[PDB]
């Protein structure tokens, strides 16, 4: 018996409306057959369409549109449907569907101008309800209404060619591993031997004043230049502490809290990072809270590192790749890094207007996608490297910390394709 539906349309142009109509007709309990309904094609669909129209199709639905009005394939299935119309002796067989307002009823195909069409130009819901009312009027065979099949075929056909897939992928990060730390942290007994109204930022190596003890990893007599009074300190007065257990967190005393002891470490790391990048002779821009460092035009060969560009030219303003480093010890010992972009009018003086700087940065980032960001970040990190596999932060005469020049690798089991 005939219980299937044929819907003719322009596949490259009328995909949306045909898909919606097929989905709703299936959900309402009708066996819908369409070209876009099935995923994959063979040489046999040319005969398949004709045999379906001749034997299994009980009724023809045509998507009337400017693209589908005069399409050779559309006209050929229209002719097959029309001949089936003649041999079936069923007047209510061809049901055209006009969905284009630009296609007037006086410009439709000759085989359609004499057939009543359901109006979809104004309201699609009204057209669908008219289709329904006509269909229950014509006693067309149907099954129990069930949208489960609708959603089913929705997943297997639509959105199936591109979705989530399972495959392992390697991932990087802006986190930088720290290879090593000094064996012990030194608190030196200075008291008057260090002036009370003295700032520790200008001192050579990083050092922070906690209570009366100077917090640094360096040797006691390393601060002779900035502190001439420090020539006669007794190293036995140091309360040097095994930093390894500080990282483990096992240490605890009334003298210092482990959270507070770890508090002093990150500030020392930040000061060492700032001092090291000062040693690299790189300029700086003042941020609201942090400090960002960029490169001039001429410091690098062609203002580029490796095969990667780091400083470019845009109209009359020079954009410079910049970084900002923060030391965090909670998840892992990591010198965290961030990406920032700043502009210079001549390449040596920074623009003092914040609004134009922000506008230029966002304009340059508008077209900046994934790969360029990673390339420039990794290039700058490799530029600041002291060795092939790591770079060190100078914060003592014999005390050093090694930080990997390679960002922290991560592994993800789920990815996709373009």
């Amino acid at each position: 018996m005939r219980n299937k539906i044929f819907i003719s349309h322009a596949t490259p142009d009328d995909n949306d409306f045909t898909r919606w109509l097929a989905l709703k007709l299936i959900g309402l309990g009708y066996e819908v057959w369409c070209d876009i309904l099935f995923l994959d094609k063979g040489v046999d669909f040319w005969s398949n369409i004709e045999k379906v129209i001749r034997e299994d199709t009980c009724k023809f639905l045509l998507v009337s549109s400017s693209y589908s009005n005069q399409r050779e394939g559309v006209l050929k299935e229209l002719a097959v449907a029309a001949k089936v119309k003649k041999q079936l002796k069923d007047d209510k067989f061809i049901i055209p569907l006009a969905i284009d307002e630009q296609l007037s009823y006086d410009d439709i195909n000759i085989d359609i101008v004499r057939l009543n069409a359901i109006d979809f130009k104004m309201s699609w819901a009204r057209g669908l309800k008219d289709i329904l009312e006509a269909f229950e009027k014509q006693k067309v065979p149907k099954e129990v209404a069930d949208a489960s099949k609708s959603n089913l075929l929705y997943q297997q056909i639509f959105l199936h060619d591109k979705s989530v897939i399972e495959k392992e992928e390697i991932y990087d990060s802006n986190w930088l591993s720290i290879l090593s730390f000094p064996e012990e942290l030194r608190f030196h007994e200075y008291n008057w031997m260090l002036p009370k109204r003295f700032d520790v930022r200008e001192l050579t190596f990083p050092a922070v004043r906690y209570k009366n003890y100077l917090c640094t990893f360096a040797w006691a007599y390393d601060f002779t230049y900035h502190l001439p009074k420090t020539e006669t300190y007794h190293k036995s007065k140091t309360i040097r502490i095994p930093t390894e257990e500080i990282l483990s967190g096992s240490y605890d005393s009334n003298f210092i809290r482990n959270a507070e002891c770890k508090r002093l470490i990150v500030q020392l790391l930040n000061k060492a990072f700032e001092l090291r990048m000062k040693d690299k002779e790189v300029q700086e821009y003042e941020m609201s809270n942090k400090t960002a460092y960029w490169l001039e035009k001429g410091k690098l060969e062609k203002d580029k590192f490796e095969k990667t560009m780091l400083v470019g030219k845009q109209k009359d303003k020079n954009w410079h790749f910049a970084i900002s480093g923060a030391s965090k010890l909670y998840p892992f010992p990591v010198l965290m890094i961030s990406s920032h972009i700043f502009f210079t009018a001549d390449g040596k003086k920074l623009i003092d207007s914040s609004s134009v700087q922000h506008s230029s940065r966002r304009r340059q980032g508008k077209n900046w996608w994934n790969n360029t960001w990673r390339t420039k970040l990794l290039a700058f990190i490799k530029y600041l490297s002291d060795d092939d596999t790591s770079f060190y932060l100078e914060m003592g005469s014999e005390e050093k910390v090694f930080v990997s020049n390679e960002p922290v690798k991560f592994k993800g089991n789920v990815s996709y394709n373009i």
Binding site: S123, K162, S338, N370
Partner: protein
């Protein structure tokens, strides 16, 4: 060899009990959960502005094709998707002469002019509610663009065009929605720029807000907002367990009174007897002294949690079995002592913090695209990172532009299974009834709590404010 785990995409339910990951697709095919017979929209503003509103409404009455269908589904029309017809006829209009704006906008004092315009709209809308026999569901108020750029703080009125309160804030939209709370009128603020912008051109001759490639999306989201305001439920969830209340805590500042006073607000979501769900604000705004505390005293903690537990009980009948307190700042023991005091033994109280502060950024080996939305980096049993913003295949484009920033989920107190809490946040990132988006970059409880707090911090005379989102978003 650290491992990355991905949570399956949450499923949101639609009418007739079908499920779809994308809200737009599921709403298009299956429609909204409840049947709304019609929307009697009220329009107030300039008589000239009525024409643009009518043009936009009968424009969205017709199917709209966007730039790329695969990236964003096209907008087919309000009636086709919502099963509710909403035309330009039958709209109640009250005329607002541009001269009326002229007297009050052209004022040197920013706060005074903002209060004048807000009153000029509010008195007219109240008279519309209380005078005409016509019934209005939601109000579409239209304001020009000159007012928009000269009715907000930090907006300097040019001297050549100056012609001529302090208790309220200059924030026009927030004050406008706050002063309507006493009368419980669902309203929607528009600018004709958000309306058919093709009339406006820049100095170059192009529209300032080029929305041609996004016209279908804006129609989708405006229709969704209008439907939700009209009293309709677009979609609901299916993966949330029974007996689970969440609550979302956000702290906001109040500048009108001496000291910021740190106003606190909350939003609540849970399940009902059977399959129904409730997603309503639960706000009793509790002010907190001291400039930068952000930690509310145990008395108001007890008040808040008792109110939430009650509002659950009169709707279900029994106390929630587990509560996952959501906030985007951590808590000290001061609140938790009172919280444990007021909770019963059966209830399992859990506190979860969400943070965007941590600049953890992931880097893929190759490609110009970002990470999946749903990956979780489990730091330990208590802390994890969730990338709710980024790329998802169904929308073909990353939800962000630059490298996404993940959410810092840490269970401050309680015990909590990490997988479940990292699974609930991903589900909660879908309930953005204010914007037809595939997903949101944070749990909607935090976002909607922030919104309701911003609205409630604009007025000081509010007493027992409404707690349904129709009057807020």
């Amino acid at each position: 060899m650290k491992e990355l785990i991905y949570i399956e995409e949450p499923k949101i339910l639609f009418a007739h009990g079908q499920k779809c990951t994308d809200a737009r697709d599921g709403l298009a095919l299956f429609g909204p959960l409840n049947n709304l017979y019609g929307i009697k929209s009220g329009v107030i503003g300039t008589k000239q502005g009525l024409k643009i509103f009518r043009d936009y409404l009968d424009h969205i009455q017709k199917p709209i094709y966007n730039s790329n269908s695969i990236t964003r589904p096209m907008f087919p029309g309000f009636e086709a998707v919502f099963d509710c017809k909403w035309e330009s006829t039958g709209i109640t209009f009250k005329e607002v002469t541009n001269e009326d704006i002229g007297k009050f906008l052209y004022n040197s004092s920013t706060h005074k002019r903002t209060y004048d315009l807000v009153s000029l709209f509010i008195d007219k809308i109240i008279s519309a509610n209380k005078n005409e026999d016509e019934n209005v569901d939601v109000w579409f108020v239209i304001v020009p663009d000159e007012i928009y750029k000269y009715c907000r703080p930090n907006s300097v009125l040019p001297k050549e065009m100056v012609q001529t309160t302090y208790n309220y804030d200059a924030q026009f939209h927030d004050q406008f929605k706050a002063r309507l709370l006493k009368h419980t009128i669902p309203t929607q603020i528009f600018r004709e720029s958000t309306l058919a912008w093709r009339d406006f051109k820049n100095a170059f001759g192009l529209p300032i807000r080029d929305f041609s490639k996004i016209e279908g999306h804006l129609a989708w989201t405006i229709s969704t907002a209008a439907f939700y305001k009209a009293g309709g439920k677009p979609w609901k969830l299916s993966d949330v367990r029974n007996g689970v209340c969440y609550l979302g805590l956000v702290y906001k500042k109040v500048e009108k009174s001496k000291n910021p006073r740190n106003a606190c607000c909350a939003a609540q979501m849970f399940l009902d007897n059977g399959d129904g769900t409730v997603f309503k604000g639960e706000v009793g705004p509790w002010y907190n002294p001291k400039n930068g505390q952000y930690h509310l005293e145990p008395k108001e903690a007890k008040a808040l949690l008792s109110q939430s537990l009650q509002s659950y009980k009169e709707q279900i009948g029994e106390y929630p079995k587990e509560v996952f307190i959501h906030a985007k700042t951590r808590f000290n023991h001061q609140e938790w002592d009172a919280f444990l005091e007021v909770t019963p033994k059966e209830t399992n109280l859990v506190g979860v913090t969400i943070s965007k502060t941590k600049p953890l950024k992931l880097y893929k080996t190759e490609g110009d695209y970002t990470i999946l939305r749903g990956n979780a980096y489990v730091v330990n049993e208590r802390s994890a990172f969730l990338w709710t913003v980024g790329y998802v295949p169904k929308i073909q484009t990353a939800l962000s532009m630059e490298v996404p920033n993940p959410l810092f989920i840490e269970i401050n107190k309680g015990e909590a299974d990490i997988k479940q809490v990292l699974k609930d946040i991903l589900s909660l990132t879908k309930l953005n009834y204010n914007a037809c988006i595939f997903a949101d970059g944070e749990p909607v409880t935090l976002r909607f709590a922030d919104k309701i707090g911003e609205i409630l911090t604009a007025s000081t005379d509010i007493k027992t404010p409404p707690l349904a989102f129709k009057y807020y978003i």
